[PDB]
Design an enzyme around this catalytic site. Structure first.
Site, PDB file in Angstrom:
ATOM      1  N   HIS A  88       0.812  -1.212   0.000  1.00  0.00           N
ATOM      2  CA  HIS A  88       0.000   0.000   0.000  1.00  0.00           C
ATOM      3  C   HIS A  88       0.848   1.266   0.000  1.00  0.00           C
ATOM      4  CE1 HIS A  88       0.868   0.708   4.207  1.00  0.00           C
ATOM      5  NE2 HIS A  88       0.232  -0.378   4.609  1.00  0.00           N
TER       6      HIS A  88
ATOM      7  N   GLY B  35       3.293   6.215   9.336  1.00  0.00           N
ATOM      8  CA  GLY B  35       4.601   6.055   8.736  1.00  0.00           C
ATOM      9  C   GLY B  35       5.442   4.938   9.317  1.00  0.00           C
TER      10      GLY B  35
ATOM     11  N   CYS C 194       4.581   1.880   9.062  1.00  0.00           N
ATOM     12  CA  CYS C 194       4.350   0.720   8.212  1.00  0.00           C
ATOM     13  C   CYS C 194       5.643   0.298   7.530  1.00  0.00           C
ATOM     14  CB  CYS C 194       3.275   1.027   7.171  1.00  0.00           C
ATOM     15  SG  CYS C 194       1.608   1.172   7.852  1.00  0.00           S
TER      16      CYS C 194
HETATM   17  O1  UZF Z   1      -1.323   2.382   7.820  1.00  0.00           O
HETATM   18  C1  UZF Z   1      -1.118   3.077   6.837  1.00  0.00           C
HETATM   19  C2  UZF Z   1       0.194   3.800   6.646  1.00  0.00           C
HETATM   20  S1  UZF Z   1       1.487   3.179   7.764  1.00  0.00           S
HETATM   21  N1  UZF Z   1      -2.093   3.260   5.880  1.00  0.00           N
HETATM   22  C3  UZF Z   1      -3.342   2.528   5.953  1.00  0.00           C
HETATM   23  C4  UZF Z   1      -3.261   1.145   6.013  1.00  0.00           C
HETATM   24  C5  UZF Z   1      -4.409   0.382   6.065  1.00  0.00           C
HETATM   25  C6  UZF Z   1      -5.639   0.989   6.040  1.00  0.00           C
HETATM   26  C7  UZF Z   1      -5.722   2.362   5.962  1.00  0.00           C
HETATM   27  C8  UZF Z   1      -4.589   3.173   5.902  1.00  0.00           C
HETATM   28  C9  UZF Z   1      -4.835   4.663   5.824  1.00  0.00           C
HETATM   29  C10 UZF Z   1      -3.621   5.617   5.798  1.00  0.00           C
HETATM   30  C11 UZF Z   1      -2.686   5.288   4.662  1.00  0.00           C
HETATM   31  C12 UZF Z   1      -2.540   6.096   3.534  1.00  0.00           C
HETATM   32  C13 UZF Z   1      -1.677   5.760   2.512  1.00  0.00           C
HETATM   33  C14 UZF Z   1      -0.945   4.599   2.588  1.00  0.00           C
HETATM   34  C15 UZF Z   1      -1.075   3.771   3.685  1.00  0.00           C
HETATM   35  C16 UZF Z   1      -1.921   4.121   4.726  1.00  0.00           C
END
Ligand code: UZF
Ligand code: UZF
Lengths: 300, 300
Positions: free
Chosen positions: B41, B143, B145
């Site tokens: 993602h 961040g 992740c």
């Molecule tokens: O957790 C993280 C980032 S560490 N993200 C996740 C993951 C799962 C569901 C939702 C989101 C929303 C925020 C967002 C936005 C863009 C890329 C990733 C992420």
């Protein structure tokens, strides 16, 4: 979100751990630039530790009696000296992995990470606090002596602790990196009193703020209190007295949560007088005091 | 002596953390040999995460859209592919700091260390457990992740976890290093049920043995029980059922302490039915389940 008792990444310190052997005694040392730091009782046998004359015992030792091994390679010792309770072994090579570093003497209530080591090899890292009575509740088996505690500011390692001994009570005692013990303790196998310990009040309050930030709010009460009224309750329950310096350090957390410090003190007072009734705060059934206000801000 | 929730020394993993940026999204990646692993993602915006078609979104990306930065130096991406929920970026250089490593898919109840990172830089390390419902209770800000969990066997790093997301309930979910999620979860911003969690019974028992080794014995009772009688109590209090495999893994701890596993089970049953009455075990007012039998033996 979430909240964990995090230790600093230990890689910069792992590159500095060596094995120091003198006679049949082996422990850990800290290799920074061309000096190896280790507890001076590396020169003692178990029988020596009952009542050691370190000056007399060191005088019987020469540079070649100190075996310093960093990984698989041996260091050549070209000098040795005693500074308070640490041995400083001058070696012929600078540790190519020496990080930027400082030696600091922390205050009670401050926290640091410990890299527990044996024979110069790291086995684990954990975060702990210097108790108000200058002990630490660590995890130190035989041969862990010379393991160090530290903080890291970006790229700078502040060494603050070197492990020296376990007291008969099961708690641990050590020195700063200049060899001065934290607390009244001496490096001798004799019964030594640690004082009455107390709870680090400012740390509990910081962790109550961390709880509010992470959604645990059941303990928030409709009360407030005064600094002097709170300290009355603090003394009863063996909490360290809260000062205006402590109120100031909690300021940023007060601003983030919108909860005045004295209101949080009233919640803590209620928790001290009534317990938790089987509830939990941040997964803990007791009040945590091993996070400083700086730790909470850093994690959150 | 003493007992701490220790994490593995993190130096071998710190040398593998890089920053991965795709479009305006940045997270952490794992650089091993000439491949960078990171959550897929990274190619999503916040609006994408509501209902992403990863194949369609990846097709719009080329090798040059992935910015991979290791410290101050940039890596050249010469290939990219999607394996389940991880992105594998082939880069032109092998990480000179690649440790010996394996990818492993752990079981619920097993433990690992997490190196929490942001923009490719480590900030902390902590030890945690894979819950029976395949979540972890971490400390993961935005961040974080791409931060990874691992175990270390001497010189070999077993990577077992990569962080992907926080559930609305505040717990965390992720994948193994092949990109398969632990649990029923998917990488999409939608409400997702974690199942009923349970307490890792074999871990509690291992930690009760650690307590006896360290002198806490007040909870030792004059009772014994049977595996089936204990599991009756376990189900009531939402503990995982104890099996003969669990009894076997506790064997070495049983031998060291001289306390039969079923006798320790009787003590645990009494603790579950009567609580702790305000007492503590190893400084905890609740039963700890984040130490495996292997963890206890390793520390003790
Ligand atoms: O957790 C993280 C980032 S560490 N993200 C996740 C993951 C799962 C569901 C939702 C989101 C929303 C925020 C967002 C936005 C863009 C890329 C990733 C992420
Ligand atoms: O703790 C350690 C080793 S890590 N030692 C200490 C320290 C203080 C008091 C007593 C002892 C007894 C065991 C012993 C024997 C030889 C050298 C050191 C040590």
């Amino acid at each position: 979100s979430g909240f964990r008792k995090m230790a600093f990444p230990s890689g910069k310190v792992e590159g500095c751990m060596v094995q120091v052997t003198c006679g049949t005694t082996t422990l850990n040392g800290l290799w920074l630039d061309d000096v190896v730091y280790c507890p001076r009782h590396v020169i003692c046998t178990s029988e020596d530790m009952l009542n050691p004359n370190y000056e007399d015992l060191l005088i019987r030792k020469s540079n070649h009696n100190f075996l310093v091994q960093a990984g698989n390679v041996q260091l050549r010792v070209i000098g040795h000296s005693m500074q308070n309770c640490v041995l400083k072994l001058k070696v012929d090579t600078a540790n190519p992995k020496t990080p930027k570093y400082k030696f600091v003497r922390i205050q009670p209530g401050q926290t640091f990470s410990v890299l527990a080591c044996y024979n110069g090899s790291p086995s684990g890292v954990y975060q702990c606090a210097m108790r108000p009575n200058f002990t630490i509740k660590g995890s130190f088996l035989n041969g862990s002596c010379g393991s160090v505690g530290f903080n890291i500011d970006y790229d700078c390692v502040s060494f603050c602790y070197m492990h020296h001994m376990e007291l008969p009570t099961g708690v641990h005692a050590g020195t700063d990196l200049e060899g001065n013990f934290y607390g009244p303790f001496v490096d001798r196998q004799t019964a030594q009193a640690a004082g009455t310990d107390t709870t680090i009040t400012v740390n509990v309050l910081a962790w109550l703020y961390a709880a509010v930030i992470n959604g645990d709010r059941w303990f928030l009460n409709r009360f407030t209190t005064t600094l002097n009224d709170f300290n009355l309750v603090a003394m009863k329950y063996n909490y360290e007295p809260l000062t205006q310096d402590h109120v100031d350090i909690l300021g940023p957390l007060s601003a983030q949560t919108g909860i005045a410090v004295l209101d949080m003190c009233a919640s803590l007072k209620e928790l001290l007088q009534n317990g938790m009734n089987g509830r939990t705060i941040l997964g803990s059934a007791l009040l945590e005091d091993e996070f400083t206000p700086f730790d909470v801000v850093r994690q959150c």
